[PDB]
Design a binder for this molecule. Sequence first.
Ligand SMILES: CCCCCCCCCCCCCCCCCC(=O)O[C@@H](COC(=O)CCCCCCCCCCCCCCC)COP(=O)(O)OC[C@H](O)CO
Ligand SMILES: CCCCCCCCCCCCCCCCCC(=O)O[C@@H](COC(=O)CCCCCCCCCCCCCCC)COP(=O)(O)OC[C@H](O)CO
Ligand SMILES: CCCCCCCCCCCCCCCCCC(=O)O[C@@H](COC(=O)CCCCCCCCCCCCCCC)COP(=O)(O)OC[C@H](O)CO
Ligand SMILES: CCCCCCCCCCCCCCCCCC(=O)O[C@@H](COC(=O)CCCCCCCCCCCCCCC)COP(=O)(O)OC[C@H](O)CO
Lengths: 799, 799
Amino acid sequence: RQPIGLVFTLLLFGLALVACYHLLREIDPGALHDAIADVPRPALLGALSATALGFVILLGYEWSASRFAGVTLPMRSLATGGFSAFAIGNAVGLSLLSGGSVRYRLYSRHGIGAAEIARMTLFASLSLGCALPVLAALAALCDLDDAASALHLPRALVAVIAIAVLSLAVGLVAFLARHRLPGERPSPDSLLVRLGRRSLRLPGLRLSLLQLLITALDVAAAATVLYLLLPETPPFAAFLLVYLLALAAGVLSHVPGGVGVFEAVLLAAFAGQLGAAPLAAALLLYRLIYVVLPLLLACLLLLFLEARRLWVTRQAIRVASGFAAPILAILVFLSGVVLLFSGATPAIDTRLEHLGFLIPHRLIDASHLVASLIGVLCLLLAQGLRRRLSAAWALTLVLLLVGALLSLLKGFDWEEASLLSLTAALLAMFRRSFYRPSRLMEVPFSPLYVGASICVVGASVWLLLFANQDVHYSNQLWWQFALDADAPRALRAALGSCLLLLALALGWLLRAAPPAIREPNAEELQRAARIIRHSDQPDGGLALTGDKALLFHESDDAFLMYARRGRSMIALYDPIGPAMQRAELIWQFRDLCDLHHARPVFYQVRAENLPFYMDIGLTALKLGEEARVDLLRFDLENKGKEMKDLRYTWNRGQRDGLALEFHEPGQAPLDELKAISDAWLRFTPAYLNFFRIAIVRHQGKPVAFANLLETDSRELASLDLMRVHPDAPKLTMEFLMLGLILHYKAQGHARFSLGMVPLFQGLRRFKDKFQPDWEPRYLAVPAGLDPLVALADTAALIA
Amino acid sequence: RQPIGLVFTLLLFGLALVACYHLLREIDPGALHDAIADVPRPALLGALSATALGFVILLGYEWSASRFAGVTLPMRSLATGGFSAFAIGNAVGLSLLSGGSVRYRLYSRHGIGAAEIARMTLFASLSLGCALPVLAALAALCDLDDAASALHLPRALVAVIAIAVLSLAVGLVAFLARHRLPGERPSPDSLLVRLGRRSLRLPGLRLSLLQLLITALDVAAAATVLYLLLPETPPFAAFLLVYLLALAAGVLSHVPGGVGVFEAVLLAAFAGQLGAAPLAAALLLYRLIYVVLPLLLACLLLLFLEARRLWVTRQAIRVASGFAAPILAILVFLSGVVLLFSGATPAIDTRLEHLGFLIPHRLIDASHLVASLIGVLCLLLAQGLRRRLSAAWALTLVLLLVGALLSLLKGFDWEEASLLSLTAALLAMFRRSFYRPSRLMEVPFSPLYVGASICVVGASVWLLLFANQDVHYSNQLWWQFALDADAPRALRAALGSCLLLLALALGWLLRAAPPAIREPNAEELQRAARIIRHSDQPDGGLALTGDKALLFHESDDAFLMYARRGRSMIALYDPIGPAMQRAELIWQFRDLCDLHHARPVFYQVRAENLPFYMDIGLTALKLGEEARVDLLRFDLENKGKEMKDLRYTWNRGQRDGLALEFHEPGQAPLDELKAISDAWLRFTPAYLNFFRIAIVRHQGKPVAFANLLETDSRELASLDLMRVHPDAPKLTMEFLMLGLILHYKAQGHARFSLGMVPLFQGLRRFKDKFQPDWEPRYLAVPAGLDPLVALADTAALIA
Ligand SMILES: CCCCCCCCCCCCCCCCCC(=O)O[C@@H](COC(=O)CCCCCCCCCCCCCCC)COP(=O)(O)OC[C@H](O)CO
Ligand SMILES: CCCCCCCCCCCCCCCCCC(=O)O[C@@H](COC(=O)CCCCCCCCCCCCCCC)COP(=O)(O)OC[C@H](O)CO
Ligand SMILES: CCCCCCCCCCCCCCCCCC(=O)O[C@@H](COC(=O)CCCCCCCCCCCCCCC)COP(=O)(O)OC[C@H](O)CO
Ligand SMILES: CCCCCCCCCCCCCCCCCC(=O)O[C@@H](COC(=O)CCCCCCCCCCCCCCC)COP(=O)(O)OC[C@H](O)CO
């Protein structure tokens, strides 16, 4: 899907550029500049105002999603999440940080579930998508003659299509209303409908209406931004209709911003009626005001909140996995786009005139080329930053400063230099955000990032051809080094960019194959055992089975056991070591999974590392609850119903003649354990002789055994393998672990772990007999929240 | 001394500037520029060649010092140390990194003693100083008429003075040769002479001659650099004589480079004969070629070797305390000098012409002023860098980039911008060098750094008056903001620099008084005890006496006990904690001592932290040797004479009826210990109840006791207080500690410490009875290696 989807995305973008070139044949870059200058200042204020209104409506859009999801959030939190997610989501789309990814980060702080947020994201997306046909139909149905003239279709055709769409919408609403199950309601404003296979959660009448009203105002507001920037305008009904179709085409095309496809359609519709230059100027200004501007504001806002959190919560925040790294990857990517577009466009004659006296003329040429190559590097380094490489931070920050310098030496492009400098100043402030000391050469290949780069380089060549259309091409142009010669500087830059991008991409893709997964050897198992001993986490013991691969840190003070099953790679627990070692290992695991084209899964993780799993792009699903008794507050002279039942079980066990014995590793009765294991029925001598075995006996004869996970420290201890005979008494097993607890209390252990119960009722009650302290265990899995998949699933179930 | 010495240094510099202004009254900056352009290219090559020769001679200068000191070093090491020490030493003098400080750092790697290096430094300095009169006298004695005409003195006078100097030199040589003690010789090429009070170590005849020959060639070579840059020249004899006197005056004046005083004298001598412009051009070029150039090369060389060491030895080097921080403080200081001098000088008319079209004219004025203020900040921040503040690194690196930018916006000063950028590029590479996270606001006041800044600002105002002498001053000049107006830009900058420097210096000096030293409270003692437990070093126990101040780290994972005695502050051991915590604490201690105007002394330090003591500017003196027995190789079934004597002592002790008992803290027989303490004669119950006491008894009655320093780990354990009765057997004490060793071997301790012997023979033998492993303990003390002090001491002893 990914490769095909990316290829058909690039083709659509490419075709759209070709379309836009042909539609702007009769216009020169002069006419465009005049058209941009022409639009009056009241109109720009009108646009900016309409933009502000149009983004206020999206906050109410976010509110409706919270009501649907049944999520209570503060107003300031919904505001920030609403703005940032819609601002970034609309701009970059899927390429970099998406709407869902923003929502999840933001709304995980307040303890909103991963399921809830996913349900908020889907509602936010689908509601526009499914309203767009209805809104379009209604728009066309007012003044059909104008709508017909705009689309250049028969009046009868567009009439029946509009009617058909409305009728189908009504028919659908009536159908899903038919299967409305009464009684139960997930949230105040929701329904649960049944179709046979799956239950489906839909909004209520009141919420459906409100959402449609919000969607209506939002579209109108957005279209209004473009309507005000047009000197001469068509009837609004037809204009709105076209805008909605163009918007649809942009969405379906899966082009990040909707760029190219949106413009192409608008241009196509109103090529002749309005004129190219006014429309092309309006479309450009529309993009800047409604798309780019709120993105920058959102980016800044999120950086501001990150910076603030670092200032106030200095102690709490340690490793730093927040918003800075994604956001700064965007800004650095945009910085590369600026450099590349600046190069394609010719310089101002006045600046070159004077700068010719300050600089050698042949250095202007050198500066111009180098700036364009730095531009390409900026596009690719955006990935490195996203993965929190410190090498990527240092290298970027150098290139941005050099790129800002060569921007001034090029054609005194002080606007390009100012943006690049400002990006550098931001990237500098967040040095600690990029903490990984991995090589840049070992970053896994990302088709998306390469695809995005190719699009930008494509767009720049489109801009080269447009901006330098006054000159007659020739074979000699490439070798002209003059000052007035602007077109040769474009050409040479364009070629340089394309060749570098090609070279790097080939150098990236044609790389040595990654080593195959192998079970650990004796040395590694011994080294793992060492780490487990000099650590807190005893659950690490399962590593020493030697049936699952071990991934070691560079310092070799931490590891992370995992195993490949099907098309996924499941880690068994959190990494084993300090917080920083944990963070580097989690990123190492993501890297390893990306090199093997496998889905990174984490099994049974604690809540403390959830932000790091968020960072690499996983969602915490509530797997089960792990119970662990506290030995500090546990005492055998206390009172309680369950406590009295336990003391009864204990004393009855002692009177019966049950005895408990502890054997250190090496001196275990292997013959007995084997016989017991066989009677019950991994169990290997190598695995067993790593741990201390507690054997309970009934009148001398061994009645059960249990190996004990334990570290050199006394913070925690657990039990993995534990088997009892069928013929053994029922209270013997309960006596055993009670004896274990007593022994650990004598040794002076802080805590003791029993185990995890998923979602079992008998096991849950049995654990609850000891009155333990519960703690949630999570499962981390990738965020598969594609709107199209969900809509296709809905449509399939309905049909 | 320091305040008086610094004041009389500044006055001499000031007076010298006034002198140089008056001597260059009849010359305009135009005539100087022409004179600088006039000197031919063969002459410059002649100068550069003479410089290269003149610095090759200084390597042989270094060699002679090694022979005198009796130091064997590799040729490459002597070369580097020779070059770097003489290059930096001659340039910056005493202000920043000095010759001795360079030598000590460089020659500490090869395990050369602190005493030896000090003796190498003194010889390197004094040999020139004491040869300079002789060389001068001899020079004058060739062609007395020319020498008389140069000095404008009578021929008879200069004759008798020269004779008197030579006669006195011969008389001195004969006198010290008289008291030449035969037999003993510290080194092959040295003598030991006696005058009654102190023994004095002098070079041999052969070494004295060779040193004088080396000194002769060196001076000649240096003078030759200046001689070739003169179009029209006087007789060389007289020229050399003057050069030597000017050099003397420069040295005596204690002006860092000899700048001002040297030029003043040369100018004074050959004002009329040669002409101002040729001489003033030659003096400037001489400074650049012979002084500034080798400094930069030395700086680069030392940075290169640091960078290489970081690349190859990544694992070994951890905290980074080498050459980068001093060297980069110099380069950043020079960068501030460049900014300040650039501002004082008027801009090129051609550049302003064109840059006027690219920039707003009023921004040129703003850029010009801001650049000069950044210049002043660069001078002061040089200190912060020296003390390895990370805040200072970040702030500098920002100001250098802004300063390099405003250099281009000022008058397109691309030379200033290029230097500043290159400094930034270096400073960036060594980010990890500045590792301390202390506040910039808490840096102690340094009169020297403030004095240096005032000199630079003084020099800039001298340059302002010289460079802008064509304009007529008026009260209105200050308020003129034009493009052609260069002199007002100088004035406004000059005033701004002076006011900022004044303001900061006053804000620095008038600061709150530092809190007084107080003994620790119960909480601190308890917190110290905690640290000691969770650590390796048991010698930290002496902190819990509570009679000495405790300095805690910000993390509170490490501390450093110290006490004030007289005018010094003695730390008792190395800091207690990790390597990074140790390095931050040592710097904290330096800071604390500088705020209280006290000499930082470290008592009984290990060899592992010697580089960090080097960093803050202390010299390791061999205090004593600490013996510590290794329990891994120690066994009671081994063979050996001393081992058999120990086993005899043990078994005889057991047969006699000596018994050893171990009491945990709290359950000590206080009544007994008190009685034993009184019988022997800090001893307080609070101090005693922190440690485990081992009490040996003779037939039941307690015969001795000894508290045991110990941590939670088993890496090391010691004993501090240990008293025995006069009437107790002689082998009872030896049995006691043998029992202690056996007990620690049973507990499974890695090592065990006995104690330190200074320089005692009986104690040394007693420790050697157990066949321990010796390890040197050092004393860290400031480096008081002032040539004048040593010469005054020598002169006093001779007389
Ligand atoms: C009309 C002319 C206008 C001139 C411009 C005037 C205004 C300039 C304002 C510039 C301020 C922005 C720079 C602030 C960066 C934050 C500093 C920082 O944190 O730097 C980090 C990175 O280190 C740096 O030094 C980065 C330097 C790069 C800054 C680049 C931005 C400035 C760009 C200036 C123009 C450059 C030229 C462009 C044109 C060619 C170090 O972080 P740390 O956590 O390791 O250290 C913190 C310390 O311990 C204290 O707590
Ligand atoms: C034309 C619209 C209709 C058809 C669209 C379909 C075809 C798509 C392909 C082309 C789309 C973009 C074309 C127009 C973009 C702007 C062109 C432009 O002016 O580019 C300048 C440079 O490129 C841009 O400005 C690019 C703008 C788009 C991206 C901006 C992102 C902003 C964020 C950057 C990172 C900074 C982050 C810090 C800020 C918080 C260079 O031209 P100049 O002559 O104006 O500049 C010279 C001199 O400096 C001043 O005159
Ligand atoms: C004719 C035009 C000529 C144009 C110039 C072309 C040549 C430019 C060459 C510049 C290269 C020098 C910069 C190298 C600096 C070392 C990088 C570095 O380590 O930076 C540290 C500081 O961080 C930075 O990003 C510093 C950036 C500042 C660099 C300043 C020098 C460049 C100056 C360019 C011109 C600026 C404009 C001047 C004029 C206004 C980060 O160290 P770290 O240990 O934290 O990270 C290492 C990582 O883990 C990988 O191992
Ligand atoms: C005059 C000699 C006899 C009398 C001496 C007694 C009086 C002492 C006080 C004055 C001493 C210095 C006077 C002359 C210094 C140089 C003047 C000069 O040219 O200054 C320029 C700037 O100042 C300097 O260059 C100062 C030079 C001295 C210090 C240099 C240190 C180098 C290291 C700096 C740090 C960089 C580190 C990285 C490099 C490895 C600005 O003038 P400009 O017109 O040449 O420049 C404009 C344009 O850019 C090009 O024309």
